[PDB]
Amino acid sequence: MQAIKCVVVGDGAVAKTCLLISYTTNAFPGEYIPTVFDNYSANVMVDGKPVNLGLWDTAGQEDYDRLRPLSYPQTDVFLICFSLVSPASFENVRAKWYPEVRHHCPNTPIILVGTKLDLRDDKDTIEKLKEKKLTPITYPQGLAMAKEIGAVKYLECSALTQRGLKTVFDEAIRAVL
Amino acid sequence: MQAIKCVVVGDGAVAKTCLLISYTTNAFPGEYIPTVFDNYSANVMVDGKPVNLGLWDTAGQEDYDRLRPLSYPQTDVFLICFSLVSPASFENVRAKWYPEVRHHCPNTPIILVGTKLDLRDDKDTIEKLKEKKLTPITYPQGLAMAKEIGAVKYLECSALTQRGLKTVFDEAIRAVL
Amino acid sequence: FNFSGNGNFHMFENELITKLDQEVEGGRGDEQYKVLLEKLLLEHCRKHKYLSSSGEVFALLVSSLLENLLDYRTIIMQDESKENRMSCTVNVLNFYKEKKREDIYIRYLYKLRDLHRDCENYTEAAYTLLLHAELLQWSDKPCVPHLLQRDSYYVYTQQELKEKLYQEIISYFDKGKMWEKAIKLSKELAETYESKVFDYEGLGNLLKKRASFYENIIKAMRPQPEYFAVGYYGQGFPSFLRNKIFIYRGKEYERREDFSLRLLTQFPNAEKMTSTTPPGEDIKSSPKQYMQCFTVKPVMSLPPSYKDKPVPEQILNYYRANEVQQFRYSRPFRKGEKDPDNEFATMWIERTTYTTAYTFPGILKWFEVKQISTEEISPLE
Amino acid sequence: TLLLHAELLQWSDKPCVPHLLQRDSYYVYTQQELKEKLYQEIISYFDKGKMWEKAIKLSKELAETYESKVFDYEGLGNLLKKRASFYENIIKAMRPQPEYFAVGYYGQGFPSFLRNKIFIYRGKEYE
């Protein structure tokens, strides 16, 4: 019986909050309970032996970079995140998050994870992206960025779906184990 | 724990049964009831361990020398008894009691014991023996008879006093021991 | 019936039921068979006077049997999943229990014992065997030859039989990692020893085991099963499923849609309702069987005699998940003005009450719900 | 005797009286803990006193007080195993019986409470 720390950060316009809270809540997609607290946890059996785990769900604004490294030690894995339908998120991660998180714990398995897979192929949304010159950037170049870091894994989920979301967390936990 | 065969015989004028019962009962002198049944038993230790035992009582008649020898076997201690206050009883014992027992099971530790020691030096009893020409025969020559057989002890006591009676049975049980 | 003018034919119809059972469950009968049976007996009862109704309702009993038995077989060799088998054999246990032919009721009771015993549901094996043990008594007399088991057959002073039964039930809970009921039973077992039979050696070994139980309880820690609610809707279901709601004791660490997968496995027409909370009226009548899966909340027990005491943790955690018969499900719902900066301005929770028939764990890893209701919760609350 | 002492106490907790807390060992010692100790060592005596009926009798209370108030399940278990030892004993080994005698004192020199009195003596087992 054992436990595992992990952190999650991402762009503030997407609220990976919803991801983790819907996952651990296990409730219906798009029907999750919004809480008043961060830093969620899960006790899950992955393969054979059950393991507890808690996720440092942190605020992502840059001025909060001054509190986050205090919890950087003994982060068993990290979960860097974005939104597929947000090239702005792409800029954020590639330019700030990816670089400085790579700096901060350069030796710890890392998996980038998509978001809004459902929204990534929302035709009205993507036509808004074109009428705002945002690109509905797809998987393969996302995988290309994963190769850019050569991340130990990469995936996407979708909160309104929980698609792969279980699998997202599956590889997440089994990366340590 | 163990139980021991214990055989006693004696002439029909003495009532050794009174000895056995007023002993096993621990009773006050003369305060017991003459029962109806024979072949007693008791369960009282001597030292160290509690030893049980079984008391073979047979009456003083002569003919039952067909049944008493079949009652003899595997008795680890037979006990022979008389009454010091009757010479006729003395000739009776060395005539029947001592011999035939010596004959049937010639190998068993043995003690001869007197009786009515309180009556043995009773002036009225001794004078009545004299006026009936019976000798209140005393310790030295009863001792000689004991020596003659070498019965591993010789004793003499009373049941109305119970004096040495308890000693009689202490050494009667250490006879096994 | 000429004899029943002095007595009854009830003995007759008893073994009639008995035999009839062993054959039909043995795999021979026909549905037209019962149709014709019914027909012919009805006609001949009409040929007869008054007793006609008596005999005919007895035949109604017979029918009821027959259709249920054939339904049993059609499921057994139509779906080929242990679990529908368990449901239907439970159905027959019920049906006989109402029909009070207690002996054959016991017979399938042992059948289901065999089932769960295969599937390591040590808990359910134990409970079922215990429903058997209940019928017996702590008297000495082996009274009636029905209750005797199918493992051997002689007197078995029912005292001794009950004693065996407890040996095995305790064994099950021991390996079933549920020692509380184990100790509960060990109480009666020791007490009956020391007060009726005085077999002290039994006392000794028994309470030795009881010490083992207390130690293993307060020592270790136990996983807790997730509880999922399932509601079968549509029109194609076996009648005992359409438009009912059931509640499930899944694995200890099975997340929701793993259970959803395992249930879809169970079924063709793997289509799910999506408004997970409410049913669908059109689906109450439409074919193309629907269902919906969602984890629910195991309402806390009410540990008796523990109302204020300085109770430790293991005690509370064990009562946390088991002996449960109430369930809630919290409903996020907007009611008010939807401010962007906050989610709390509208949050109204219509938690759904789930009152089922019995309490997990049970003889079955799931159960229906007997009664449901909702609530309404202010963001204040 | 020690049982007579323990009888004064209660299965409550509040150490209501320091009087019972003698000079031998003496600190916080809630009432409960005193009663429990006393029962422990009384059971001790009875067992090594080779007399078991009352032993199991009192163990019954001790156990149930555990499992109702203090939940010391380890102590529960050890206690119960000892009770099993007791039961095995009672059925297993037969114990010697003690002789009982009567003693009626009479006269005058005997003390005031002893003169002209009658006593009964639970003598030793085979005296």
mmCIF file of C-alpha atoms in Angstrom, chain C residues 104-280:
data_model
loop_
_atom_site.group_PDB
_atom_site.id
_atom_site.type_symbol
_atom_site.label_atom_id
_atom_site.label_comp_id
_atom_site.label_asym_id
_atom_site.label_seq_id
_atom_site.Cartn_x
_atom_site.Cartn_y
_atom_site.Cartn_z
ATOM 1 C CA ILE C 104 -36.950 -27.569 -2.849
ATOM 2 C CA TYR C 105 -36.407 -23.977 -1.838
ATOM 3 C CA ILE C 106 -33.446 -25.331 0.116
ATOM 4 C CA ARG C 107 -32.464 -27.377 -2.897
ATOM 5 C CA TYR C 108 -31.931 -24.387 -5.141
ATOM 6 C CA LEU C 109 -30.516 -22.609 -2.136
ATOM 7 C CA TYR C 110 -27.678 -25.098 -2.231
ATOM 8 C CA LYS C 111 -27.614 -24.691 -5.998
ATOM 9 C CA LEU C 112 -26.879 -20.995 -5.648
ATOM 10 C CA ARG C 113 -24.408 -21.919 -2.940
ATOM 11 C CA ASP C 114 -22.589 -23.919 -5.588
ATOM 12 C CA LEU C 115 -22.746 -20.932 -7.908
ATOM 13 C CA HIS C 116 -21.226 -18.349 -5.581
ATOM 14 C CA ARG C 117 -18.801 -20.942 -4.246
ATOM 15 C CA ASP C 118 -17.451 -21.175 -7.770
ATOM 16 C CA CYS C 119 -17.074 -17.398 -8.041
ATOM 17 C CA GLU C 120 -15.327 -16.741 -4.683
ATOM 18 C CA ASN C 121 -18.254 -14.636 -3.489
ATOM 19 C CA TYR C 122 -17.414 -16.093 -0.109
ATOM 20 C CA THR C 123 -19.735 -13.472 1.329
ATOM 21 C CA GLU C 124 -22.706 -14.554 -0.752
ATOM 22 C CA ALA C 125 -21.998 -18.246 -0.309
ATOM 23 C CA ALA C 126 -21.928 -17.601 3.415
ATOM 24 C CA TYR C 127 -25.140 -15.594 3.481
ATOM 25 C CA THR C 128 -27.077 -18.084 1.404
ATOM 26 C CA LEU C 129 -25.864 -21.018 3.441
ATOM 27 C CA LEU C 130 -26.937 -18.914 6.413
ATOM 28 C CA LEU C 131 -30.457 -18.461 5.097
ATOM 29 C CA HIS C 132 -30.428 -22.219 5.156
ATOM 30 C CA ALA C 133 -29.021 -22.355 8.679
ATOM 31 C CA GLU C 134 -31.837 -20.057 9.749
ATOM 32 C CA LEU C 135 -34.538 -22.618 9.028
ATOM 33 C CA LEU C 136 -32.859 -25.094 11.352
ATOM 34 C CA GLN C 137 -33.125 -24.810 15.123
ATOM 35 C CA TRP C 138 -31.046 -25.163 18.262
ATOM 36 C CA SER C 139 -33.137 -28.058 19.500
ATOM 37 C CA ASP C 140 -31.762 -31.587 19.571
ATOM 38 C CA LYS C 141 -34.374 -33.515 17.631
ATOM 39 C CA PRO C 142 -33.761 -34.051 13.927
ATOM 40 C CA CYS C 143 -37.394 -33.270 13.272
ATOM 41 C CA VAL C 144 -38.224 -33.446 9.554
ATOM 42 C CA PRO C 145 -36.212 -35.211 6.833
ATOM 43 C CA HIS C 146 -36.519 -32.414 4.262
ATOM 44 C CA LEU C 147 -33.934 -30.032 5.721
ATOM 45 C CA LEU C 148 -31.194 -32.702 5.568
ATOM 46 C CA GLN C 149 -28.516 -31.638 3.103
ATOM 47 C CA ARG C 150 -27.456 -33.380 -0.103
ATOM 48 C CA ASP C 151 -23.925 -34.185 1.104
ATOM 49 C CA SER C 152 -25.033 -37.200 3.176
ATOM 50 C CA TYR C 153 -28.260 -38.322 4.813
ATOM 51 C CA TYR C 154 -28.900 -39.658 8.283
ATOM 52 C CA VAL C 155 -30.310 -38.309 11.539
ATOM 53 C CA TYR C 156 -28.039 -35.311 12.099
ATOM 54 C CA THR C 157 -29.484 -33.941 15.301
ATOM 55 C CA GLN C 158 -30.388 -30.548 13.929
ATOM 56 C CA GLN C 159 -28.286 -29.113 16.706
ATOM 57 C CA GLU C 160 -25.230 -30.758 15.154
ATOM 58 C CA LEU C 161 -26.266 -29.772 11.643
ATOM 59 C CA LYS C 162 -26.555 -26.113 12.596
ATOM 60 C CA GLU C 163 -23.145 -26.529 14.200
ATOM 61 C CA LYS C 164 -21.623 -27.710 10.939
ATOM 62 C CA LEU C 165 -23.350 -24.918 9.070
ATOM 63 C CA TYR C 166 -21.724 -22.390 11.335
ATOM 64 C CA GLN C 167 -18.324 -24.001 10.849
ATOM 65 C CA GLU C 168 -18.560 -23.427 7.119
ATOM 66 C CA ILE C 169 -20.188 -19.990 7.289
ATOM 67 C CA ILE C 170 -17.452 -18.818 9.626
ATOM 68 C CA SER C 171 -14.942 -20.336 7.235
ATOM 69 C CA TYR C 172 -16.406 -18.318 4.369
ATOM 70 C CA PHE C 173 -16.362 -15.016 6.206
ATOM 71 C CA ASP C 174 -12.839 -15.739 7.392
ATOM 72 C CA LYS C 175 -11.599 -16.098 3.859
ATOM 73 C CA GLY C 176 -14.243 -13.570 2.860
ATOM 74 C CA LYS C 177 -12.398 -10.820 4.747
ATOM 75 C CA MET C 178 -15.486 -9.847 6.723
ATOM 76 C CA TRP C 179 -14.922 -10.848 10.321
ATOM 77 C CA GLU C 180 -17.634 -8.860 12.081
ATOM 78 C CA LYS C 181 -20.498 -11.158 11.200
ATOM 79 C CA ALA C 182 -18.016 -13.959 11.790
ATOM 80 C CA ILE C 183 -17.683 -12.984 15.433
ATOM 81 C CA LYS C 184 -21.407 -12.350 15.625
ATOM 82 C CA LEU C 185 -22.056 -15.969 14.699
ATOM 83 C CA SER C 186 -19.224 -17.277 16.849
ATOM 84 C CA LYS C 187 -21.142 -15.844 19.771
ATOM 85 C CA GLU C 188 -24.160 -18.089 19.250
ATOM 86 C CA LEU C 189 -21.937 -21.024 18.483
ATOM 87 C CA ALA C 190 -19.957 -20.787 21.704
ATOM 88 C CA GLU C 191 -23.018 -19.981 23.768
ATOM 89 C CA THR C 192 -24.930 -22.975 22.480
ATOM 90 C CA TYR C 193 -21.916 -25.175 23.125
ATOM 91 C CA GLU C 194 -21.465 -24.088 26.703
ATOM 92 C CA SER C 195 -25.170 -24.013 27.528
ATOM 93 C CA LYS C 196 -26.596 -27.059 25.777
ATOM 94 C CA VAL C 197 -23.804 -29.459 24.866
ATOM 95 C CA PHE C 198 -20.860 -28.412 27.061
ATOM 96 C CA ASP C 199 -18.374 -29.585 24.446
ATOM 97 C CA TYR C 200 -15.718 -27.351 25.933
ATOM 98 C CA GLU C 201 -13.152 -28.225 23.295
ATOM 99 C CA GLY C 202 -15.430 -26.699 20.704
ATOM 100 C CA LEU C 203 -15.603 -23.602 22.875
ATOM 101 C CA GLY C 204 -11.839 -23.402 22.972
ATOM 102 C CA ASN C 205 -11.141 -23.728 19.278
ATOM 103 C CA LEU C 206 -14.059 -21.462 18.412
ATOM 104 C CA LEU C 207 -13.021 -18.557 20.575
ATOM 105 C CA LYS C 208 -9.424 -19.055 19.537
ATOM 106 C CA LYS C 209 -10.661 -18.270 16.059
ATOM 107 C CA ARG C 210 -12.636 -15.365 17.494
ATOM 108 C CA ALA C 211 -9.430 -13.880 18.862
ATOM 109 C CA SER C 212 -7.918 -14.218 15.410
ATOM 110 C CA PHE C 213 -10.919 -12.313 14.080
ATOM 111 C CA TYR C 214 -10.650 -9.385 16.470
ATOM 112 C CA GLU C 215 -6.930 -9.071 15.815
ATOM 113 C CA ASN C 216 -7.269 -9.128 12.041
ATOM 114 C CA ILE C 217 -10.072 -6.582 12.190
ATOM 115 C CA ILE C 218 -8.467 -3.914 14.262
ATOM 116 C CA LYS C 219 -5.094 -4.559 12.670
ATOM 117 C CA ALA C 220 -5.373 -4.373 8.905
ATOM 118 C CA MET C 221 -7.272 -2.135 6.487
ATOM 119 C CA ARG C 222 -9.848 -3.005 3.869
ATOM 120 C CA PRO C 223 -10.698 -1.750 0.401
ATOM 121 C CA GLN C 224 -14.207 -0.480 -0.185
ATOM 122 C CA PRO C 225 -16.365 -1.404 -3.209
ATOM 123 C CA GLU C 226 -17.638 1.318 -5.477
ATOM 124 C CA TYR C 227 -21.417 1.350 -5.682
ATOM 125 C CA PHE C 228 -23.038 1.766 -9.076
ATOM 126 C CA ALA C 229 -26.695 2.253 -9.867
ATOM 127 C CA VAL C 230 -28.148 0.761 -13.044
ATOM 128 C CA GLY C 231 -31.565 1.341 -14.563
ATOM 129 C CA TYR C 232 -32.767 -0.898 -17.368
ATOM 130 C CA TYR C 233 -35.142 0.882 -19.714
ATOM 131 C CA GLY C 234 -36.605 0.219 -23.116
ATOM 132 C CA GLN C 235 -38.864 -2.633 -24.025
ATOM 133 C CA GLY C 236 -36.726 -5.639 -24.910
ATOM 134 C CA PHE C 237 -35.629 -6.572 -21.413
ATOM 135 C CA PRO C 238 -36.565 -9.676 -19.479
ATOM 136 C CA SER C 239 -39.641 -8.365 -17.719
ATOM 137 C CA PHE C 240 -37.891 -8.178 -14.337
ATOM 138 C CA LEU C 241 -35.465 -5.638 -15.824
ATOM 139 C CA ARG C 242 -37.412 -3.227 -18.030
ATOM 140 C CA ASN C 243 -37.879 0.133 -16.335
ATOM 141 C CA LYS C 244 -36.452 -0.862 -12.988
ATOM 142 C CA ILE C 245 -33.422 0.500 -11.164
ATOM 143 C CA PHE C 246 -30.769 -1.678 -9.606
ATOM 144 C CA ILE C 247 -27.815 -0.990 -7.357
ATOM 145 C CA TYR C 248 -24.497 -2.780 -7.552
ATOM 146 C CA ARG C 249 -21.539 -3.751 -5.364
ATOM 147 C CA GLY C 250 -18.753 -3.611 -7.899
ATOM 148 C CA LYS C 251 -15.084 -4.238 -7.378
ATOM 149 C CA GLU C 252 -13.315 -2.245 -4.688
ATOM 150 C CA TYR C 253 -11.326 -0.236 -7.242
ATOM 151 C CA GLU C 254 -13.444 -0.417 -10.367
ATOM 152 C CA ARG C 255 -14.045 3.041 -11.765
ATOM 153 C CA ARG C 256 -17.417 3.815 -13.270
ATOM 154 C CA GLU C 257 -17.038 2.977 -16.903
ATOM 155 C CA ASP C 258 -15.064 -0.177 -16.304
ATOM 156 C CA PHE C 259 -18.285 -1.347 -14.705
ATOM 157 C CA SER C 260 -20.169 0.121 -17.642
ATOM 158 C CA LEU C 261 -18.008 -1.967 -19.966
ATOM 159 C CA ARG C 262 -18.550 -5.138 -17.971
ATOM 160 C CA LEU C 263 -22.295 -4.608 -18.058
ATOM 161 C CA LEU C 264 -22.396 -3.837 -21.774
ATOM 162 C CA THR C 265 -20.525 -7.118 -22.177
ATOM 163 C CA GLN C 266 -23.491 -8.780 -20.455
ATOM 164 C CA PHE C 267 -25.790 -7.422 -23.121
ATOM 165 C CA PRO C 268 -26.431 -7.005 -26.793
ATOM 166 C CA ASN C 269 -27.938 -3.639 -27.767
ATOM 167 C CA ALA C 270 -25.169 -1.829 -25.922
ATOM 168 C CA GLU C 271 -26.797 1.609 -25.916
ATOM 169 C CA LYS C 272 -26.660 3.909 -22.918
ATOM 170 C CA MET C 273 -28.938 6.607 -21.670
ATOM 171 C CA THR C 274 -27.050 9.868 -21.260
ATOM 172 C CA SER C 275 -29.142 12.102 -18.987
ATOM 173 C CA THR C 276 -27.809 9.912 -16.244
ATOM 174 C CA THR C 277 -30.146 11.168 -13.556
ATOM 175 C CA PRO C 278 -33.715 11.048 -14.913
ATOM 176 C CA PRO C 279 -35.421 8.220 -16.804
ATOM 177 C CA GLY C 280 -36.961 8.612 -20.235
#
